[PDB]
Amino acid sequence: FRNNYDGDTVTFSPTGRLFQVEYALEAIKQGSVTVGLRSNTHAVLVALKRNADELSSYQKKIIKCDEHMGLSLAGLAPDARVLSNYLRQQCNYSSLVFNRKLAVERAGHLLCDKAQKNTQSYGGRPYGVGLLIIGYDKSGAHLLEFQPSGNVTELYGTAIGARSQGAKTYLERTLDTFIKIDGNPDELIKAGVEAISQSLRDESLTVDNLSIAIVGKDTPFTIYDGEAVAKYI
Amino acid sequence: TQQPIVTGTSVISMKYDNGVIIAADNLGSYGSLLRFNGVERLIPVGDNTVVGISGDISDMQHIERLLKDLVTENAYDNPLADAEEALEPSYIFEYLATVMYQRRSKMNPLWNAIIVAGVQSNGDQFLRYVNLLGVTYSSPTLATGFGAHMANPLLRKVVDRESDIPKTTVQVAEEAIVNAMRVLYYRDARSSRNFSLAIIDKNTGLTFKKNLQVENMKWDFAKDIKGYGTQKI
Secondary structure (H helix, E strand, O other), X not given: OHHHOOOOOOOOOOOOOOHHHXXXXXXXXXXXXXXXXXXXXXXXXXXXXXXXXOOOOEOOOEEEOOOXXXXXXXXXXXXXXXXXXXXXXXXXHHHHHHOOOOOHHHHHHHHHHHHHHOOOOOOOOOOOEXXXXXXXXXXXXXXXXXXOOOOEEEOOEEEEOOOHHXXXXXHHHHHHHHOOOOOOHHHHHHHHHHHHHHHOOOOOOOOOOEEEEEEEOXXXXXXXXXXXXXXXX | OOOOOEEEOOOEEEEEOOEEEEEEEOOEEEOOEEEEOOOOOEEEOOOOEEEEEEEEHHHHHHHHHHHHHHHHHHHOOOOOOOOOOOOOHHHXXXXXXXXXXXXXXXXXXXXXXXEEEEEOOOOOEEEEEEEOOOOEEOOOEEEOOHHHHHXXXXXXXXXXXXXXXXXOOHHHHHHHHHHHHHHHHHHOXXXXXXXXXXXXXXXXEEEEEEEEXXXXXXXXXXXXXXXXXXXXX
């Protein structure tokens, strides 16, 4: 079965599945966990950075796409660089040409369409990385979840990566609570760290291990690492 | 590089306390032949923007088609197309400006002079000019071609500097502009007596007046004038 229908993205299995796409989705699960959640004034990204050795650094997992947009990655880092770079250009284009900031919902559509092209043609490969996009635009705070399949969804919160299910249930529970953390970033961030620690197991989030990013009403997308996140551990 | 054929003359405009006014006659000249009389050179875009165009008419019609498409395109996958994500006057302008400059840089311009008038979502007045060279500028009053020499001096007697805007009412403004149209009919050999006028008020919205006419002209003193110096009868 599968073995005969998973040699490339251009082949459908007898049940209508696309194994290469599914194998790509697998790379995400093997990726370190990252969380995203938003109130009505802010959007936050909390990501667990993973290290190779104890002599190595903890790979950055958050990328800023513009002053009002950014994302967190889970999976093949190179593919996030490509996709975020494309998102950076799209935001730049909107500004230069229309003097308009790119809608978070529009960015989602653009990512979906770029990912889709890599799942219908011979020769390419699907992207092997998941992305959580947060941003504040003309309609408020936003959070998006991007899957290599090309599926992008808008949510109040979510998590992707290994053991992500922990944080996801926590948020699906804490919903009514954090969705109202308006005008208080610190509270939103803490709620983010509390959701992410719901997916821990190995260790505990440390200073050079935790990575947080926030954006909102009067807050340009900014990234906090190390000492700067100490007050949240 | 080209040469205009069918052309539209002046486009005059100014801003008042609650919005902006813009006008243009209905003529499409062909050299010295006043060939076409039912030409509308004022292009409304949505209900907060009016684009006035002078210059080559064939290119104007092309700018028209571009503007219709912008509206269509903006609607695509945009649940807020008639709300928070509708086209702002500044978006319309930046787009056109971009095109005008690209076209001159390719040595194949859109032979026009454009004035984009409108009200931004936050109530601000918007008045900016762009032409075949891609040159752009803003001023409390703006006019193209002939109206730059004759209309601006009049309109500027009402709104000489920024601080005069809040002191200028729609009545005073529309009056200034209607008088300017008469003066242009007096001294511009490529003008028509019929014209269109449009108001974009942050409270009353967009008011588009068609089929106006220069009225209350002074010609009686013409009878007292005979010869060109010494002739008595």
